[PDB]
């Protein structure tokens, strides 16, 4: 039955994973770049906490940004329901994917397959886009879906991703939050393969136990202390079995990761996921020797310090042209700090800024909307330097001073930190600041959009203040040199010196 208020199907355990994946990919969904799977106790009863709410909201935001798939129980019981709510909220403000897996026997109501729909034990989730049901049998027998779920994950992990980073593979991170009887089994079966999991060291009782562990008597004591009710109710015979699982879970720690309780930063979730994936990739040992792929993987996420300390190390061959591709991507990927690291770690910017690379950057990555806005602005005002800049961009789209071209490109797209980083390298430092202030002030009075005018005015004022302070210090150092710099005219930067630009842009403060 498919109901609209995504397709909902009932599947037998004999269904082939390959065919199901082929259907899901070819028919409805697009290529998956990452799979986040959440495992929590199937019990409906649950208690929310402020930190858990924030953590899961940030997880959903990260998944949406990357475009990962989300797999959950989808039984409309407690936490899962909240997750669905969050998804719907993000749908209100290209689309998130949330697959729920459950069993036919649990479902209270059954409707035969036009479209058959019903509006309303264990009622199914309402916000989940796609749902599946297990129809093996044993209506009264629960906990049947688990097996199939695992078979679904592994096939995805082993299959080639045919995508950049992670050595042509897929993350498939496994997640743990909360304590449950089936949580240990799920974690053990996930860790059996090369599937790293991260466990939140928060409310989760079993999660707290696992975090604390990182002897049989010690494990038993910890388990008894943390979950007195479950241990007391459970028979002694089963406990031994549980211990075995724990051992395996604790035997392999390189895959296992835990979130620190003290940490309160926003990016804690991203840090944990990135570190876990980095551990897995490095310990794979199939491609651990190489450093280009690892550097790219760490660049995809904004882990600059870890990437530095690991990849670059000390007394390690950095290569002369190795950083070319990574820094090119960083410039495309808008990672100012990585660009600064590359520049200060040995990269030669003058050599890299070749004619071909600049032509490629200006030809395609240039925003079409920005191109049209610049064309209309040049048509309207057409000042002395507007024609110069427009001619330069047109020439590159079809005594070179490529640095000024790169700086202009960075400014035109309203990038603050990257623009400042590029500014810290130019030769004509002061004149560039005045030119940028004039260029921003030209558009400051567009009046089409209220917000962008404020941002542009603030940027122009900041550049003006920087220029004023720089020249003040320069004059306080040497008087005659400052005057010579004032009279000096750059190598056709705009055909004008600092004074002319300052007077043209009605810069009263600079002249005063």
């Amino acid at each position: 039955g498919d109901i609209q208020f995504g397709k909902y199907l009932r599947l037998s355990c004999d269904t082939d994973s390959e065919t199901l994946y082929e259907l899901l990919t070819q028919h409805w969904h697009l290529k998956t770049p990452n799979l986040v799977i959440s495992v929590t106790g199937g019990a409906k009863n649950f208690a929310l906490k402020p930190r858990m709410r924030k953590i899961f909201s940030r997880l959903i935001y990260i998944a949406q940004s990357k475009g990962a798939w989300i797999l959950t129980g989808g039984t409309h019981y407690g936490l899962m329901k909240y997750i669905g709510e969050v998804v719907r909220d993000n749908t209100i403000s290209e689309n998130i994917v949330a697959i729920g897996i459950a069993a036919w026997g649990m479902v209270s109501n059954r409707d035969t397959l036009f479209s058959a729909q019903y509006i309303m034990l264990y009622i199914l989730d309402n916000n989940h886009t796609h749902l599946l049901l297990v129809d093996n049998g044993c209506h009264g027998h629960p906990t049947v879906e688990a097996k199939l779920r695992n078979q679904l994950e592994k096939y995805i992990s082993e299959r080639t991703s045919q995508d950049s980073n992670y050595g042509g593979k897929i993350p498939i991170v496994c997640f743990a939050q909360g304590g449950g009887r089936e949580t240990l089994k799920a974690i053990n079966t996930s860790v059996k393969s090369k599937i790293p999991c991260v466990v939140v060291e928060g409310s989760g009782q079993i999660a707290d136990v696992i975090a604390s562990l990182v002897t049989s008597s010690m494990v038993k004591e910890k388990l008894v202390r943390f979950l007195p009710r479950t241990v007391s109710r459970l028979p002694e015979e089963e406990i031994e079995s549980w211990i075995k699982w724990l051992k395996e879970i604790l035997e392999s720690s390189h895959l296992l990761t835990v979130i620190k309780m003290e940490e309160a930063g926003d990016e804690i979730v991203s840090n944990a996921i990135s570190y876990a994936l980095y551990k897995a990739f490095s310990t794979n040992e199939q491609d651990k020797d190489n450093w280009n792929g690892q550097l790219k993987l760490l660049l995809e996420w904004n882990q600059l310090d870890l990437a530095s300390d690991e990849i670059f190390t000390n007394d390690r061959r950095w290569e002369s042209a190795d950083l070319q591709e990574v820094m090119f991507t960083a410039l495309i990927k808008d990672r100012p700090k990585f660009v600064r690291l590359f520049l200060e770690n040995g990269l030669n910017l003058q050599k890299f800024l070749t004619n071909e690379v600049l032509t490629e950057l200006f030809s395609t990555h240039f925003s079409t909307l920005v191109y049209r806005n610049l064309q209309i602005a040049k048509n309207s005002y057409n000042d002395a330097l507007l024609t110069f800049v427009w001619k330069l961009v047109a020439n590159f789209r079809r005594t070179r001073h490529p640095l000024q071209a790169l700086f202009i490109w960075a400014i035109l797209q309203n990038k603050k930190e990257l623009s400042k980083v590029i500014w810290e390298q130019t030769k004509g430092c002061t004149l560039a600041a005045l030119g940028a202030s004039k260029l921003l002030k030209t558009l400051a009075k567009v009046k089409n959009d209220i917000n962008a005018a404020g941002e542009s005015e603030e940027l122009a004022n900041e550049y003006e203040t920087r220029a004023v302070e720089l020249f003040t210090e320069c004059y306080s150092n040497d008087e005659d040199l400052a005057e010579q710099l004032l009279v000096y005219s750059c190598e056709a930067w705009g055909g004008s010196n600092c004074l002319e630009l300052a007077v043209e842009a009605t810069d009263q403060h600079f002249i005063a």
Partner: peptide
């Protein structure tokens, strides 16, 4: 259209 082939595919 697709539903028939899908149903036959899983059976």
């Amino acid at each position: 259209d697709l539903v028939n082939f899908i149903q036959a595919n899983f059976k």
